[PDB]
A paper describes a structure:
We show that the cryptophyte Hemiselmis andersenii expresses an energetically complex antenna comprising three distinct spectrotypes of phycobiliprotein, each composed of two αβ protomers but with different quaternary structures arising from a diverse α subunit family. We report crystal structures of the major phycobiliprotein from each spectrotype. We propose that the macromolecular organization of the cryptophyte antenna consists of bulk open and open-braced forms that transfer excitations to photosystems via this bridging closed form phycobiliprotein.
Four new structures of HaPE555 were determined (resolutions: 1.57 Å, 1.67 Å, 1.73 Å and 1.95 Å). The largest peak of HaPE555 (555 A) is by far the most abundant PBP constituting approximately 63% of the overall protein complement (with other HaPE555 spectrotype peaks contributing 8%). The filaments are generated via knobs-into-holes packing but differ in the distances between adjacent molecules along the filament (having either tight or loose interfaces).
Numbering used by the authors:
A (entry chain B), B (entry chain D): 16 to 177
C (entry chain F): 1 to 64
D (entry chain A): 2 to 64
Write the structure that this text describes.
Amino acid sequence: AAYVGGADLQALKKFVSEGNKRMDSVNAIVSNASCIVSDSVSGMVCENPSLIAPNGGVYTNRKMAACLRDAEIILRYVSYSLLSGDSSVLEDRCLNGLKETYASLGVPAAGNARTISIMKATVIGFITNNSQQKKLSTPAGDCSALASEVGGYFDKVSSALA
Amino acid sequence: AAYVGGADLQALKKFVSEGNKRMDSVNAIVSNASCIVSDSVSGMVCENPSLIAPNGGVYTNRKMAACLRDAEIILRYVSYSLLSGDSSVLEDRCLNGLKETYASLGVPAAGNARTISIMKATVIGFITNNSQQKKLSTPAGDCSALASEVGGYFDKVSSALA
Amino acid sequence: AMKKDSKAPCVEVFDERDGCKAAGTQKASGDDGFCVKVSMKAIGFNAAEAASVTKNYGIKRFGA
Amino acid sequence: MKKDSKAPCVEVFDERDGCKAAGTQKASGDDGFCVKVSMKAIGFNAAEAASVTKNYGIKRFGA
Ligand SMILES: *CCC1=C(C)C(=O)N/C1=C\c1[nH]c(/C=C2\N=C(C[C@H]3NC(=O)C([C@H](*)C)=C3C)C(C)=C2CCC(=O)O)c(CCC(=O)O)c1C
Ligand SMILES: *CCC1=C(C)C(=O)N/C1=C\c1[nH]c(/C=C2\N=C(C[C@H]3NC(=O)C([C@H](*)C)=C3C)C(C)=C2CCC(=O)O)c(CCC(=O)O)c1C
Ligand SMILES: *[C@@H](C)[C@H]1/C(=C/C2=NC(=C\c3[nH]c(C[C@H]4NC(=O)C(C=C)=C4C)c(C)c3CCC(=O)O)/C(CCC(=O)O)=C2C)NC(=O)[C@@H]1C
Ligand SMILES: *[C@@H](C)[C@H]1/C(=C/C2=NC(=C\c3[nH]c(C[C@H]4NC(=O)C(C=C)=C4C)c(C)c3CCC(=O)O)/C(CCC(=O)O)=C2C)NC(=O)[C@@H]1C
Ligand SMILES: *[C@@H](C)[C@H]1/C(=C/C2=NC(=C\c3[nH]c(C[C@H]4NC(=O)C(C=C)=C4C)c(C)c3CCC(=O)O)/C(CCC(=O)O)=C2C)NC(=O)[C@@H]1C
Ligand SMILES: *[C@@H](C)[C@H]1/C(=C/C2=NC(=C\c3[nH]c(C[C@H]4NC(=O)C(C=C)=C4C)c(C)c3CCC(=O)O)/C(CCC(=O)O)=C2C)NC(=O)[C@@H]1C
Ligand SMILES: *[C@H](C)[C@H]1/C(=C/C2=NC(=C\c3[nH]c(C[C@H]4NC(=O)C(C=C)=C4C)c(C)c3CCC(=O)O)/C(CCC(=O)O)=C2C)NC(=O)[C@@H]1C
Ligand SMILES: *[C@H](C)[C@H]1/C(=C/C2=NC(=C\c3[nH]c(C[C@H]4NC(=O)C(C=C)=C4C)c(C)c3CCC(=O)O)/C(CCC(=O)O)=C2C)NC(=O)[C@@H]1C
């Protein structure tokens, strides 16, 4: 387990204003990971209820559970990329080999694409003050840069999984 | 830790009334313990926002955190009361002396009463499937007797702290 | 008595009638899929949840 | 991807109010700020699975 504090923490943020907003952006993902995942997987099914009919992608609690698990796994690798400003860990430990594993399992790519897309939208919403039930406890201001960046990581995931 | 299955669970379901509905009820509380507590303590605050103004009962994360903890403790003792059809544990290990301690700290009885009544309303709403963001995945039927029993357990809490 | 130890009975309800089993979780006799766990545990402070309630308490949620 | 469900769990701490848990000073600094990262197995949650199965068609959060 790694701990980043003091000067270690400040080489993480590198520049004053944006670095604070980054830490706030990463906090908003992990502090809401559960509902992000639940709402994104719910939206997937919402738009394609056939995913939950017999032998659909998330029919039975096991499959639904595995999907919610995977969505959080992915969300968390994305949070780590946004903490560190690079996608390398996400690529080598999360995406590398992942599409082929889904292929053998029979996980439908389209569903993944929409879970990822909703997960993206939800995270950007929190970062741009568009979240309606829960606001982040940050100083008001504009985080449009960190929204673009984290969108990039999600788009990386989409490009490999859709 | 006790684990209760097979023949012991068939026995449990005979020294308690409406075994299967009862377990569904217990599950409905414990599965939603965090949002029940969050929504109940939020509602005590938004009805009396002075509780979270300086040196109010839940100003600062520490006081707010101790409150959320307490509500969850209480809720779990109620959950255990509904599991066994019996409030002896709740009385002995939660209620006895709790007013004495809160009166010393002056945790105001009015904010407690309101947090307690919202938890009860929330729990009763789940058990009757009057909850709106989430319904229970149970066979449809009449759970009014158990809703009233658990309300009774919350009422022992209210009475003890009043 | 209330022991001032933050300890509460943590009850867990299990309905595994679909047959899906997690490894190492069979702690008792039976094959109807049902189980209940009960253990006393301390309930901890959650700084994150406290910070959230402090910012958002004025938002009505869940269709309440 | 090792098929072991492990993911980087990032925890952000903001304890600038001064409230401290005994024994939780694990890095250097006097900010109140700390980020902790560990690899943990993300598990299956049959309860949340059941809930999504039932409740997916309820629009929440004003989403
Ligand atoms: C963590 C949950 C949450 C809080 C708390 C909050 O304030 N906002 C939250 C979540 C959130 N969701 C979105 C966006 C979407 N959610 C869905 C799924 C739901 N739509 C459905 O039709 C459906 C079934 C009926 C749902 C389940 C969808 C489709 C979106 C939009 C995705 C998109 O492409 O834009 C957000 C983003 C901002 C917003 O509120 O719309 C957030 C923060
Ligand atoms: C556990 C969260 C939840 C889900 C999920 C769900 O589907 N329903 C949920 C909670 C729930 N809450 C209530 C009732 C109340 N909640 C509050 C607090 C909020 N009201 C506010 O005005 C506010 C501040 C602005 C709050 C935060 C209150 C006051 C109640 C009413 C309690 C009473 O005295 O009767 C319920 C009960 C069913 C319902 O929808 O009302 C539920 C299930
Ligand atoms: C987009 C993310 C958000 C938003 C973020 C802002 N944060 C601003 C200032 C700020 N945030 C923190 C906490 C942050 N710093 C850390 O080291 C860590 C680690 C735990 C965290 C959680 C700090 C210390 C600061 C600077 C102090 C302050 O200004 O209060 C901020 C203002 C930027 C500036 O001062 O130039 C913003 C915009 N704000 C939003 O409206 C969206 C929702
Ligand atoms: C308020 C409680 C609900 C309501 C609940 C009902 N459950 C009914 C039957 C039922 N529920 C279960 C699961 C339960 N039994 C256990 O042993 C455990 C775990 C240890 C649990 C979680 C079972 C097995 C059954 C019987 C088998 C089946 O019916 O599939 C039920 C029908 C009447 C009855 O059997 O008493 C009801 C009404 N229903 C509602 O509408 C509210 C919201
Ligand atoms: C006081 C009762 C507060 C509260 C404090 C808690 N912190 C907990 C764990 C924890 N806090 C930190 C940050 C601290 N350690 C450092 O090294 C530095 C910077 C140099 C900081 C600012 C860390 C790293 C940790 C985890 C330590 C570990 O991984 O072993 C904690 C226990 C729960 C948790 O792990 O989050 C508490 C109760 N919590 C509250 O609600 C009030 C407001
Ligand atoms: C298959 C992957 C499912 C799923 C299963 C899981 N169950 C987990 C914990 C657990 N389950 C029981 C009930 C089981 N044990 C028994 O002895 C009996 C009958 C006598 C039954 C019906 C218990 C008691 C427990 C907790 C065990 C303990 O206290 O250590 C569980 C979590 C394992 C973990 O998080 O490490 C899982 C994944 N979960 C799913 O989502 C699919 C549908
Ligand atoms: C949810 C948006 C999807 C959905 C996802 C499913 N994944 C299933 C099994 C599974 N997923 C992985 C990759 C996962 N394990 C890891 O270690 C990593 C990265 C670190 C992640 C991303 C693996 C290896 C597995 C195999 C089971 C395991 O080893 O735990 C799964 C069950 C498939 C089945 O056997 O029926 C599902 C359903 N399914 C959907 O329809 C949506 C689009
Ligand atoms: C929220 C509904 C209240 C609120 C609650 C507070 N309670 C505080 C400290 C405290 N709570 C207890 C009872 C608790 N401990 C247990 O072991 C059990 C049951 C087994 C329970 C239910 C005790 C004994 C104490 C004193 C020692 C401690 O904190 O662990 C608390 C902090 C008060 C202080 O700092 O002196 C609060 C804020 N506060 C409110 O305004 C609403 C109404």
